[PDB]
Amino acid sequence: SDQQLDCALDLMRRLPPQQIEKNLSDLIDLVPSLCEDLLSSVDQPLKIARDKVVGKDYLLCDYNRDGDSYRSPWSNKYDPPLEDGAMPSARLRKLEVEANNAFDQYRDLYFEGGVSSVYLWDLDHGFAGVILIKKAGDGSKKIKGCWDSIHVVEVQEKSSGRTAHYKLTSTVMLWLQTNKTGSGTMNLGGSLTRQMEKDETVSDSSPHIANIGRLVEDMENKIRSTLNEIYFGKTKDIVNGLRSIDAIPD
């Protein structure tokens, strides 16, 4: 079980990234004992639901989940409905709404489409949150892709609330596929996780969301840079070592 976990994780890192949902399902079909452990620690594509009250999309993750229901950031209601689903405090809920709006603009500006959601929760010496972004690239038989990012941030207020410590853990999943005459079918799939910690000043002009916004924006700009190198540089260098157009000397 402890070792079976290690094996099921290593296996999911090694199988085809386009097959996560099927492979993971299949992997649950043979060690059901690790079902919950697998569902939470394996990177999966983000799922979208529609808020039935106001008709807007939101994203699903474990942090807006209670039992088999999920809480919408728009209406603050669970679906399927629950009498006593876990809710943020009135004060945290206010900040959650400000965060959803600010990150919606961030998404519009860097992604020009897709869906984003933010859910917050309380901690002893501050709070935490998740920022989810999904942008799919549909509209061509020749070229397809999808970006999914998840950012977990932990905030610890310090110096009587004049500064705070921020801890960010971010994962981006990225898939691309082209079907062209010269290069045939090319499929690139995978992911990258990064962590960053910063103290920043907190004030009227630099409030928590602005600090979280800057932290997430930088993290995604750095991750994007690194994926570019790894996806379109490293794998290419490896292709070019398998075969050489010019004759190999000696």
């Binding site: 085809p16 043979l30 990258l192 602005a210 292709v239 075969r243």
Partner: protein, 267 residues
């Protein structure tokens, strides 16, 4: 369900990235935890993996290596090495050749085969750093066929990456013409920073003229070389296109206004 478990185990083993079979096999063994069932329904998978991957193998006493492919499958666990005129038993588990025996396959296409083999080996030595190839000459549904197979790999677990190139070219010879059917495949796994896989393939269907064995093999190799150069050049062009365009359409580097966001304004 137990028939379904083995079927899943077998699907998993079959999808091992090049150079990572042992790891995937180990994972799947400890997971199924039924070493008995593993041997039963997932032995068709070891063989299927070896033949899909064009696994190269060294036979004691012969300089080259030969590729394990469906084309050299003689049945009953034996494979043909057409260059050396031997058959051998292959142990798909250990990946070891043994019991080499002479095999004089009835020489109908043999001259053609030997002339293609000779031109292909020189080509593969010139263009594939650790490349191996095998040429078969066989009759398929009545038609004389040359099947040229090329494998090249680089396994660098210490640098956290593996890659493999496979190509397969089938020339159905009906003088003075030949039908050409090829498939080129590439697979790369890089996991030193992050984790990414490239899977790529290209199908080719064409026709060409043929004359004598020696001249025709020379031109088969020119056709292969050009087509494989074309794919490789298109691949690197497509890399540039995905980098500067397709990636941008998912997430830009900067907003349209080309300034980092002003978070106070947004708030």
């Amino acid at each position: 369900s137990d028939e379904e478990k083995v079927r899943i185990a077998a699907k998993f083993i079959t999808h091992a990235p090049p150079g990572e079979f042992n790891e995937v096999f180990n994972d799947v063994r400890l997971l199924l935890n039924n070493d008995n069932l593993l041997r039963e329904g997932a032995a068709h998978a070891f063989a299927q993996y070896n033949m899909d991957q064009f696994t190269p193998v060294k036979i004691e006493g012969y300089d080259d290596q030969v590729l394990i492919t469906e084309h050299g499958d003689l049945g009953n666990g034996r494979f043909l090495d057409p260059r050396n005129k031997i058959s051998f038993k292959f142990d798909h588990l250990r990946k070891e050749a043994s019991d080499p025996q002479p095999e004089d396959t009835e020489s109908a296409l043999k001259q053609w085969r030997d002339a293609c083999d000779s031109a292909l080996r020189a080509y593969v030595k010139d263009h594939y750093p650790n490349g191996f190839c095998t040429v078969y000459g066989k009759s398929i549904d009545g038609q004389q066929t040359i099947i040229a197979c090329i494998e090249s790999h680089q396994f660098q677990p210490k640098n956290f990456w593996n890659g493999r190139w496979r190509s397969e070219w089938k020339f159905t010879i009906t003088p003075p013409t030949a039908q050409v059917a090829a498939v080129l495949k590439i697979q790369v796994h890089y996991y030193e920073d992050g984790n990414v896989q490239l899977v790529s393939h290209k199908d080719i269907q064409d026709s060409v003229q043929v004359s004598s064995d020696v001249q025709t093999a020379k031109e088969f190799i020119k056709i292969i070389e050009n087509a494989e150069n074309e794919y490789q050049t298109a691949i690197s062009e497509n890399y540039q296109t995905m980098s500067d365009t397709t990636f941008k359409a998912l997430r830009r580097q900067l907003p349209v206004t080309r300034t980092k966001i002003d978070w106070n304004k947004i708030l």
